[PDB]
Subunit: 328 residues, 4 copies
């Protein structure tokens, strides 16, 4: 997966991700009104939302769980794969706020209005490997959290501790740890967005064959480290050169560059890993935008079109039917 935070020319804050996986997880878009009692029938535990929530997820026995989402206050959160380097506790740790892996997304969005509130709450938190149901194990995750201040954080639990990083890059992918990727960025200080039209190689004149010679050296594969580098620099270039032009579609242009394509990222089980969907949350507006591998048209669900004091969880069907404008 690849997460991205981007500010538009109008001062609006976009946040979302490419969700890159080789299967459907039975997903739908899910809306939860404020003051709603989410009931986990498995362990008879409950969570009452303080804030209305909207995001992509799945419902297990009437209990909502999210992959990524936002709330009415303009807080966004997304979970991304984090293999090898993650470490969850086997059981609750006495004295800590213990949050089961699958519930972390909802725990953030239901409870807190800002990155600052989340940061404070995470100081004494611990992520625990208790699953939603014993036959549905948790996956290995880390999270990116972002809000209307334009600040983002990265949350990674290692065996050492629950790390909370300020994210000044605007991006997240997968393993290794976040500090590893930040240090990796230093390898690419030689990249240039500006054309290099020629090079005098002594008695041989060299000429650029086309645009783009300044970025030769940028990695083109789909591994987490390469995707991180590409999005970090594509984002930086757009902000440097085109701050006053940034709008919703630009978010998709950036992520499309690191989206997986059917056939070329094959798992050991011979399945194609794809960018299943790409979400873009407009935090100020409470609009969850998304498209899918099958249907590239952007769909918009606006939580403000719902009754935020409603008494039902609402869902919207994941759109996988290509939407074409028939001009004539």
């Amino acid at each position: 997966c690849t997460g991205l935070a981007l500010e538009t020319k109008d001062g609006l804050h976009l946040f979302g991700l490419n969700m890159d996986i080789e299967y459907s997880f039975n997903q739908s878009i899910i809306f939860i009104p404020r003051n709603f009692k989410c009931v986990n029938k498995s362990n008879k535990k409950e969570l009452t939302t303080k804030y209305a929530v909207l995001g992509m997820g799945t419902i297990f026995d009437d209990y909502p769980t999210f992959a990524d989402g936002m709330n009415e206050k303009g807080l966004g959160c997304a979970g991304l794969n984090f293999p090898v380097y993650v470490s969850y506790s086997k059981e609750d740790i006495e004295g800590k706020t213990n949050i089961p892996v699958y519930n972390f997304l909802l725990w953030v969005l239901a409870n807190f209005s800002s990155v600052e509130e989340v940061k404070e709450a995470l100081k004494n938190a611990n992520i625990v490997d208790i699953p939603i149901s014993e036959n549905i194990p948790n996956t290995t995750l880390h999270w990116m959290i972002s809000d209307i201040t334009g600040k983002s954080i990265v949350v990674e639990q290692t065996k050492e501790k629950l790390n909370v990083f300020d994210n000044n890059i605007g991006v997240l992918t997968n393993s290794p740890t976040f500090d590893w990727h930040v240090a990796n960025l230093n390898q690419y200080v030689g990249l240039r967005y500006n054309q290099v039209p020629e090079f005098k190689l002594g008695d041989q004149s060299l000429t650029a064959l086309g645009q783009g010679t300044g970025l030769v050296g940028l990695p083109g594969d789909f591994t987490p480290a390469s995707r991180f580098i590409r999005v970090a620099f594509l984002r930086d270039a757009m902000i440097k050169n085109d701050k006053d032009s940034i709008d919703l579609i630009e978010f998709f242009h950036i992520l499309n560059n690191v989206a997986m394509v059917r056939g070329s990222t094959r798992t050991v089980e011979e399945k194609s890993d794809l960018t299943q969907y790409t979400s873009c949350m407009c935090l100020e507006k409470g609009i969850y935008y998304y498209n899918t591998y099958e249907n590239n048209q952007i769909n918009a669900i606006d939580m403000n079109k719902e009754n935020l004091d409603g008494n039902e969880i609402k869902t919207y069907k994941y759109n996988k039917t290509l939407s074409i404008n028939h001009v004539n």
Copy 2:
């Protein structure tokens, strides 16, 4: 620019390109019925279409010129930038079929029903640097031509001759010459679409950090050579692994990977080179599909919805208004 030919699971042939440029060229989609007299008011020359034509282009003084297009017989043609290595004659060459650069697209689509017909006609052809108007110079181009047989050719005029290559790769970009790119493909025989999960480095166990380790080495920049490699291999992987799943959207997924993003491909004049539009012609069906940098929704113009024996050139406005599905 990046051209692509791809066959769908239903045996339909798609052909089109990313048109990558730093400006608008006043483009519209243009339809010309069959038996239509295209009149060039500049030199009082004419061309009467044998076949109905549909494509992207511009009209100068009522005379249509195309960047890319198709005809009613399922023949497609696209022009792509070809700097440095191109050579056009300064004037007509006695004994040859002389075709002005700007008119080549229309000359192909108006006259011929197939790649095979085109190939024969090009044996004695010469591309001449006579412009549409003395103040509108020609640009440096090469062309990809493809039809319902699934065969594609590449047309490149050098100082040596007018080269016509069989294109077994399914792709075209820009300079160097086509044979150069074909030889460049050999550098990448070590690429693997299948995950490499681990490597035993003597006393150190190495583990894949995420999917995609088989393609490490794929170039990630936006130069013509790198784009050619990426599309060639993305296309090959999809055909190898997912032949029976290939549909219209897959064409866009492939090209999106090599699409330029605002800000990061800056010209010496400090303009951003972008993928302005992406066309996809369904050759059997006479449908010209396209989207744009501004509006990613696919738009469809179907020439068969027109009177092919009509008496007017028809145009359709280039769509740059983002089209969103408002779900709720």
Copy 3:
């Protein structure tokens, strides 16, 4: 700099480095007998060697300091540049063994017979930024230590603590931290030492143009991370495929691949960074082998040809005069 540990076919252990710098540091090879009182006239501190020492260094006011060296017990140590991530204490830390940066090399070799002894001693150690003379500041260093057991460690002081890593890779370069490079190795699990002679790209047959197609993707520049990857894999390939052939010259073949070449690694002060010298210590034999940028012939200083109970420090002039065998 690039450090390397390698075992020969005869079970001998080689350890040394490319010393990559843009200037001379007034170096000579320095031999110190055992039970010798090294006197620092600056601070009137002393160090009496337990073991005889041989290595490359410089003498300040009769006090020896080393860049790299070995002792009579078969322990080797080398210091390599470690900018940005290093942190030394400003003064002694109460309760710790405090070792001034410049003295660390000698402190290791003078005192300890093995990696195991060193590891124990470092548990309560701290590296302090006290210079040899107030006008000769310390440099930013980390160290590799290795012995006749074939075990190697890496010593890095950060602001967090004095880290001691087991080094199962057999190599060290410069920043980032050692764990960063170990994680970076995972990016390259797709590398193959075995030729890939062909690739069937659908209707296009691709053929290897020469040997080496399996390693396409290996980085070719001279940065610390790239040098680390190259040496790690060159070393691994040689052990995997040619364990029973490894001899002294192989050590130089590996390091030559990452050696800097005059002209192409230019500093901001417009000086060429070069591999000034390459050392190779045969730990069991007490032989310090080295060559230089100017003279590539390997020179051997054997500490066992000296009186290990001698009463003088001895030096040997750094050889920069190309040595040619005139055959006829």
Copy 4:
């Protein structure tokens, strides 16, 4: 193989190559006086030298054949592998100067005093696939020829014709064709020899981790194309920055960077491809310098120490015994 031509600070011209192969070819250094009748006992053909010759080769039934060599006039020639793209005639072509593949080296050095003379002679030449003995087939070769003027040419026979290229790069490797590599150089116009110390990534400061950030993007593998790029740029940097320092050892520093290392370039027959030897001919002086994988000390054979009007071919044994300077 990798060929290199380089001029020293004293205006002397060096020319030679890394000979990269997975086996011994029974080589020795061979000297032939002038006016010497070389007799091929196989076909009873002869060649009388006009000029004295010195180089690496093998003698079949008293007939000398060379891999690389020089003559008394300061002309040098080397043969390098050229698979796939080479085409030799099956028999003599009427009206041409027909030169058997294996004899080309000697034909150049025995007959001609300069590149200019060679160029003229090649206008009507054809390389023929007639072997030295029916059980010793020719190999696929192209050649680099260079002289005391500092001019170099590349000779490649394709099915189209015998191509003679001016070589303004100073280097040669293997396939593809020479013009292909020249065009490939254009991909690397973005390389910089000068350090890039930092990059401001918006709210993240990026810092160079070590020297060499300007060359990130340089390919590090051992394929012909990658070796060509590396040597071309290493050579260019040294001439640009250090023209007045270039001496004999610099030639070896450049080639060492592209030398194959045992274990990591494995053939399909599971043999290690190595840089067997590296030659460096000082053209003005008639000195053939070389070292080997086993013995890195440079050995010098000076043809001017021989009687150039002698009556015997003379040989010198290929030195594979590591030569060490025992300092103490």
